[PDB]
Amino acid sequence: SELDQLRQEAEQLKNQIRDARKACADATLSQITNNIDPVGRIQMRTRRTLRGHLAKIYAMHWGTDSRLLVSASQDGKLIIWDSYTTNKVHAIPLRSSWVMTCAYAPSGNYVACGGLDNICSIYNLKTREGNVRVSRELAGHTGYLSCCRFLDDNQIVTSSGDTTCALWDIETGQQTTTFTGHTGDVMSLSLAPDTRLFVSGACDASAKLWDVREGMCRQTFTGHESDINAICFFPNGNAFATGSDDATCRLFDLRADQELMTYSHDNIICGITSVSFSKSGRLLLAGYDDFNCNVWDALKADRAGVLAGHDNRVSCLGVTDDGMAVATGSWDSFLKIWN
Amino acid sequence: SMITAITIMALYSIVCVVGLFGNFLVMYVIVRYTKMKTATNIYIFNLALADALATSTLPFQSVNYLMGTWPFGTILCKIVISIDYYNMFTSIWTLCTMSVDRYIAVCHPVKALDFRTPRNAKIINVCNWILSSAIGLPVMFMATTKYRQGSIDCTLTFSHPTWYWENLLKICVFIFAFIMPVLIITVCYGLMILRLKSVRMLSGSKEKDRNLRRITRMVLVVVAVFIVCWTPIHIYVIIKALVTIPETTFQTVSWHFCIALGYTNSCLNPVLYAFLDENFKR
Amino acid sequence: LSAEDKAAVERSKMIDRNLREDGEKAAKEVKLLLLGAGESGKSTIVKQMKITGIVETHFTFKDLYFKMFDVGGQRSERKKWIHCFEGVTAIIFCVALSDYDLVLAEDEEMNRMHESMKLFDSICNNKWFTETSIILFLNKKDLFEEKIKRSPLTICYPEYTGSNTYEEAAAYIQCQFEDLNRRKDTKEIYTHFTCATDTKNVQFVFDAVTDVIIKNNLKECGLY
Amino acid sequence: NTASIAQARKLVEQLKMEANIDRIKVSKAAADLMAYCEAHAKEDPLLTPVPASENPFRE
Amino acid sequence: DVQLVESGGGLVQPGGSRKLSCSASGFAFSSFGMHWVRQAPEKGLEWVAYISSGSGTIYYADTVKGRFTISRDDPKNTLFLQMTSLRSEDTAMYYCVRSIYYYGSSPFDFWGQGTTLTVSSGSDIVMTQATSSVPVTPGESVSISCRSSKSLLHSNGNTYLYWFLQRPGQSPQLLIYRMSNLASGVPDRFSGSGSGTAFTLTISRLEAEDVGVYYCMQHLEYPLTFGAGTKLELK
Amino acid sequence: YXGFX
């Protein structure tokens, strides 16, 4: 009855942690922020429509110059757009068209993508030859690639349906650190601003904070009732929201190790596919299966605005590093730039 | 007198206002919602454009009838006549092209994969415009103003022997705008229905049989509307070209009714194709 | 305005034309999703249509270029990736007829044949596949003839009251699978009794795919 | 069986670590978030839109 | 390994015709806007013709339009210049130059080896390098200057000024593109600055191999025009 | 058609 004694001991440890969290919940952020003024009329307009994809868009990523962005679609194309002019800078043909994620290196020298091929492909954007070339195919995951984010030109973190995350050395192509402990498909990850930590969201309805260099889970955050599809760090690195199938966004503070706020409306019942913060953190933007993007007041939980410009699922979105614009990508094959 | 004038004006104004409003609404809906991604939408758009252009000539004909004189000068005379013939051909041959497109879509699906691209649809539509210009331009050159018994008449002139060129033009119009279109449309749609009768998605359940029945009804209605609208004016033109029939108020009203009934094709066309299309119902 | 952006705008149009021309090829593609429990006969069909996640194969037949995707090894929740296959022309679902009498494993909940029905129920009724035709390859008919001589169908279907002839058992099994379709009026199942030696099955999928193309063309042409 | 017992002591080891972390009060945690928003509100172009001459997507 | 190898040069009588070729290897030739630039025996660089990737856009210099035809054969990775009515003033070394244009690209980043041609016996932006030569010693710091008759700063924010270096006996090499950007493979001891009309290329701790002729060039509008060049002599 | 004479 060793398995019996352990299964009961885990319940006591869970109860201890629950009690410790309750002990420091002397108030809620909502009552703390009652005094501050609401943001009011958020009237965002479409300034650009990026046309040229011929299938559903599943991912995009802004470059660090806040001008270039990459998009990935099931038409087998990775397109880099100049968002100021709408010019297509590159059109990269993918060996496998079943992509689910893409990423832009902070240096701008590389893009990444992957999906149901279980491979994260690295693409060199700055070749002497003049075209884009696959520089590395990172193989070793046993489920689909759901997300990836560069740490730098030589390191990238991936998430996979195999329930693990991995840190890769791009030069050698080897998994140098693995991140195990999730019990369901990992759908999304978000890098801390200092790149020392990242958080992951999984189909076990939990989020986990991982220490990159030590390779283990520091904290585990529960509260969601269904799939976590999306996750994003607060700009100061001390919190992160979690888009979920439960039509909710539950901001979790790291240092207080618990939920601070939920963002939901009684008339919103669809899943959330993507989340991102504005530059100051005041606005939480989230993309919904109901074809809309909702803009939440992150401090007061009131909805501030709506972006309704797509004819199909919003599958991805992102805010520029300078905060000047948000891009939304959609199953309807278009991207739109808003500010 | 005044009664017959009033009724004929009313007919023309009805088949003018209704035609323009319907076709412009179709144009608006196409430009804003549908989008030119499908081959069919390009055909429907070009058809609606041609049909609106054709219906734009009707107020000038009504005015010409009302005063019995053409006050708009040789410039407009030329342009109007050319536009009228150009529209007749573009609308009729757009319907023919759409019938061929649907026949190919149903009977030759593998070849339809390569043929029925939107690029090819635009190319075919432009080609139809060039062939129609091959007649519209000669009509524009031949069109002139002549002093009639009353005041002046915007009509067509012919080189000597005038009867020869006039009968040639009438025969060419009758063959290429009526006989050949009717034959092509009827054959294409008959073959399409015959092929559709032997498709596993429409030869099983009673709901699938109902779907086959509504498709067949759609085809039969389009063909019947085309024939009913266009046959009488062509018959009348042939009779008046072959036989000198005495003029009567009844003859005048019947003639103008036949013209209006020809344009009734232009008025029913957007409603039948654009409004009664399952793709548009979304 | 547009000093050196003119060459950039020109480059954007030159690669925007190649996107259009590459989508024209893809628009002619017949996309096939191969599904089925392990050992149902999927790899035999793959060999028949011939001479790391999504294994892919392509072949030409009667001037149609087919592209078939075998989900294969994909250890994950289907609900998270199945929507990627919205828009495939047809699903080919392989069912092992001879699996009906397979003994339960050590901790197996149900027998192999009923697991196939559960997969078929989930796929056929999936919200992303409402308008997708399902082609059913009932394979290993040769092995079925040997097994049915000695092993009664009641092992698999306790409610079955018929005889253990091929004709009665095959018709009943086909009916049991086709009855799972809750959208018969909008979705059509194309059932074939293929085997390891059958060669008309590739023709069967071509005929089934041609009907699907008619439905798509009728929908596009406004007649549906 | 041998996989459930291996995971069971790994789960205990992980829970032990997670229980031992240093936690701050939610009130202090909540204050830090409010302080960040106010201190950076002026440099957030989505909160306080900039004139069209300062807007790259209108220039 | 990027290669551009010109051929077809030689001695020709005046009024005759001659076809030059440029053979490309080691890169994606097709997606590169090619450029013919020529250099008279004891003179500077002069732009001759441009054909874009896809051949959709062709520009000629005034002194050659009507007489010269530029073309490319993409399947065989070859560039052509069909010349007719050759004059004595056409005698020059002809360089084939590749140039790809997109956001952040580096145009004019590779020049061919050159082929020698010998012929027997206004609105254009003027680029000015007022200093024709400069004596230098290793380790010292130099500043070369260039000026334009028109502002090179565009409403998009870019200033379209390029710096090239031609070492003795070799083809010109890109150093700076759009006034401040360091070309790939160029040591960080070079730097460029300026504003609108006046521009400066600065070298820190100049080494031995740095000696040569430095040309500025505007890419604001066609025809592209070079400065007369500034030579760096050893003391 | 048939108009104008």
XYZ file of C-alpha atoms in Angstrom, chain B:
282
model
C -53.923 57.811 -78.170
C -52.818 59.183 -74.795
C -53.802 55.888 -73.139
C -51.509 53.824 -75.370
C -48.674 56.325 -74.951
C -49.049 56.312 -71.157
C -49.109 52.516 -70.918
C -46.033 52.101 -73.138
C -44.108 54.731 -71.162
C -45.095 52.920 -67.961
C -43.810 49.596 -69.325
C -40.483 51.151 -70.315
C -40.089 52.963 -66.990
C -40.857 49.772 -65.056
C -38.339 47.654 -66.968
C -35.830 50.502 -66.683
C -36.030 51.387 -62.983
C -36.369 47.745 -61.904
C -33.509 46.622 -64.138
C -31.070 49.300 -63.005
C -31.966 49.013 -59.316
C -31.680 45.223 -59.305
C -28.437 45.074 -61.252
C -26.796 47.879 -59.250
C -27.795 46.140 -56.015
C -26.235 42.935 -57.370
C -23.063 44.857 -58.274
C -22.892 46.331 -54.760
C -23.417 42.959 -53.068
C -20.744 41.343 -55.247
C -18.197 44.105 -54.619
C -18.759 44.212 -50.847
C -19.488 40.665 -49.643
C -18.892 37.748 -52.058
C -15.514 38.883 -53.501
C -14.048 37.664 -56.807
C -12.554 34.440 -55.518
C -14.890 32.037 -57.352
C -15.217 31.772 -61.120
C -19.008 32.036 -60.815
C -18.847 35.419 -59.072
C -16.817 36.919 -61.925
C -19.397 35.703 -64.442
C -22.282 37.015 -62.334
C -20.510 40.366 -61.918
C -19.806 40.790 -65.640
C -23.359 39.678 -66.431
C -24.817 42.237 -64.016
C -22.565 44.966 -65.444
C -23.596 44.230 -69.031
C -27.249 43.952 -68.032
C -27.197 47.302 -66.200
C -25.576 48.891 -69.247
C -28.320 47.438 -71.455
C -31.048 48.720 -69.136
C -29.442 52.190 -69.185
C -30.558 52.619 -72.828
C -34.284 52.274 -72.056
C -34.993 55.900 -70.961
C -33.592 57.148 -74.277
C -35.895 54.796 -76.203
C -38.849 55.926 -74.087
C -38.034 59.587 -74.774
C -37.614 58.872 -78.496
C -41.041 57.226 -78.505
C -42.657 60.039 -76.517
C -41.602 62.917 -78.738
C -41.301 60.805 -81.878
C -37.953 62.534 -82.422
C -34.360 62.160 -81.224
C -33.232 65.428 -79.551
C -29.877 64.157 -78.231
C -27.776 64.708 -81.379
C -25.538 62.459 -83.463
C -22.992 61.962 -80.646
C -25.494 60.333 -78.304
C -27.220 58.634 -81.253
C -23.984 56.833 -82.171
C -23.067 55.981 -78.581
C -26.541 54.780 -77.547
C -26.998 52.527 -80.592
C -23.553 50.979 -80.150
C -24.104 50.465 -76.419
C -27.463 48.799 -77.061
C -26.046 46.246 -79.506
C -22.911 45.720 -77.400
C -24.994 45.059 -74.289
C -27.336 42.662 -76.092
C -24.406 40.543 -77.194
C -22.435 40.723 -73.944
C -25.415 39.752 -71.773
C -26.528 36.905 -74.039
C -23.048 35.466 -74.470
C -22.335 35.836 -70.752
C -25.353 33.615 -70.110
C -23.989 31.174 -72.703
C -20.538 31.208 -71.082
C -22.082 30.548 -67.660
C -24.047 27.608 -69.066
C -20.881 26.136 -70.577
C -19.027 26.706 -67.292
C -21.706 24.837 -65.330
C -21.841 21.999 -67.868
C -18.057 21.602 -67.616
C -18.185 21.800 -63.810
C -20.651 18.913 -63.650
C -19.733 16.671 -66.602
C -15.915 17.069 -66.709
C -14.784 17.637 -63.103
C -11.124 16.717 -63.635
C -10.777 19.092 -66.580
C -12.984 21.523 -64.649
C -10.268 21.661 -61.992
C -7.838 23.285 -64.439
C -10.337 25.181 -66.610
C -12.574 26.822 -63.991
C -9.983 29.051 -62.309
C -10.899 32.712 -61.635
C -8.058 33.812 -63.924
C -9.549 31.814 -66.797
C -13.011 33.193 -65.991
C -11.703 36.766 -66.238
C -9.909 35.934 -69.495
C -13.056 34.383 -70.997
C -15.170 37.361 -69.920
C -12.699 39.804 -71.504
C -12.729 37.682 -74.662
C -16.523 37.935 -74.742
C -16.155 41.711 -74.480
C -13.771 41.819 -77.473
C -16.015 39.656 -79.675
C -19.012 41.794 -78.750
C -16.966 44.888 -79.657
C -16.400 43.302 -83.071
C -20.078 44.098 -83.730
C -20.624 47.086 -81.442
C -18.020 49.179 -83.269
C -19.426 48.636 -86.814
C -22.876 49.508 -85.458
C -21.408 52.716 -84.017
C -19.851 53.628 -87.367
C -23.014 52.860 -89.357
C -25.256 54.711 -86.890
C -26.140 58.255 -87.987
C -28.960 60.792 -87.852
C -31.247 61.116 -90.888
C -34.044 63.602 -91.477
C -37.295 61.636 -91.275
C -40.710 62.673 -92.575
C -41.455 64.197 -89.188
C -38.317 65.812 -87.791
C -35.203 63.615 -87.385
C -34.555 59.916 -86.755
C -31.626 58.232 -85.015
C -31.434 54.958 -86.961
C -28.998 52.736 -88.864
C -27.936 53.386 -92.458
C -26.715 50.910 -95.061
C -24.596 50.967 -98.197
C -26.260 50.180 -101.501
C -27.920 47.765 -101.881
C -29.496 48.826 -98.576
C -31.868 45.839 -98.398
C -28.905 43.457 -98.651
C -26.912 44.875 -95.736
C -30.066 45.373 -93.653
C -31.184 41.764 -94.110
C -27.615 40.583 -93.482
C -27.486 42.463 -90.171
C -30.920 41.190 -89.118
C -30.040 37.589 -90.020
C -26.674 37.761 -88.249
C -28.298 39.163 -85.100
C -31.048 36.525 -85.192
C -28.582 33.655 -85.628
C -25.852 34.698 -83.207
C -27.985 36.319 -80.492
C -30.936 33.892 -80.518
C -30.542 30.526 -82.287
C -26.973 29.718 -81.254
C -27.426 30.925 -77.632
C -30.687 29.014 -77.168
C -29.136 25.848 -78.600
C -25.951 26.099 -76.519
C -27.823 26.844 -73.280
C -30.446 24.131 -73.760
C -27.902 21.464 -74.725
C -25.471 22.330 -71.921
C -28.190 22.339 -69.271
C -29.888 19.190 -70.561
C -26.575 17.345 -70.432
C -25.881 18.765 -66.967
C -29.246 17.521 -65.667
C -28.740 14.097 -67.264
C -25.326 13.762 -65.608
C -26.715 14.962 -62.267
C -29.442 12.296 -62.375
C -26.671 9.681 -61.965
C -24.832 11.120 -58.940
C -24.895 9.203 -55.656
C -25.576 12.409 -53.697
C -28.924 12.937 -55.457
C -30.277 9.406 -56.087
C -31.014 8.047 -52.616
C -33.096 9.672 -49.885
C -36.193 11.796 -50.395
C -34.333 14.935 -49.294
C -31.638 14.239 -51.893
C -34.354 13.671 -54.499
C -35.850 17.020 -53.464
C -32.434 18.620 -53.988
C -32.226 17.111 -57.473
C -35.746 18.369 -58.214
C -34.914 21.925 -57.149
C -31.729 21.922 -59.257
C -33.679 20.680 -62.286
C -36.336 23.335 -61.654
C -33.647 26.032 -61.489
C -32.264 24.961 -64.865
C -35.686 24.712 -66.520
C -36.699 28.124 -65.154
C -33.560 29.854 -66.427
C -34.008 28.334 -69.896
C -37.735 29.111 -70.028
C -37.193 32.718 -68.927
C -34.525 33.231 -71.594
C -36.701 31.771 -74.361
C -39.909 33.548 -73.326
C -38.112 36.883 -73.008
C -36.130 36.802 -76.252
C -38.179 34.788 -78.781
C -41.080 37.253 -79.374
C -38.977 40.263 -80.395
C -36.951 38.132 -82.814
C -40.118 36.621 -84.302
C -41.606 40.100 -84.715
C -38.440 41.424 -86.374
C -38.447 38.495 -88.812
C -42.134 38.983 -89.641
C -41.705 42.722 -90.225
C -38.631 42.026 -92.376
C -40.442 39.424 -94.494
C -43.957 40.915 -94.670
C -45.218 44.487 -94.904
C -47.831 44.542 -92.129
C -50.129 47.599 -91.896
C -49.546 49.897 -88.940
C -52.093 50.150 -86.134
C -52.171 51.352 -82.540
C -52.327 47.644 -81.685
C -49.211 47.018 -83.769
C -47.354 49.862 -82.037
C -48.265 48.676 -78.531
C -47.452 45.047 -79.385
C -44.073 46.064 -80.842
C -43.106 48.143 -77.816
C -44.329 45.346 -75.539
C -42.099 42.875 -77.387
C -39.120 45.205 -76.887
C -39.955 45.633 -73.194
C -40.351 41.848 -72.911
C -36.896 41.407 -74.402
C -35.551 43.746 -71.726
C -37.552 41.741 -69.163
C -34.764 39.187 -69.535
C -32.453 41.966 -68.348
C -34.815 42.579 -65.433
C -35.305 38.946 -64.327
C -31.647 37.952 -64.800
C -30.202 39.502 -61.590
C -33.140 38.223 -59.517
C -32.893 34.675 -60.880
C -29.115 34.274 -60.695
C -28.020 36.582 -57.853
C -31.040 36.423 -55.535
C -31.961 32.752 -55.950
C -28.383 31.485 -55.520
C -27.636 29.366 -52.457
C -24.110 30.810 -52.369
C -25.562 34.320 -52.058
C -27.766 33.064 -49.196
C -25.137 33.429 -46.486
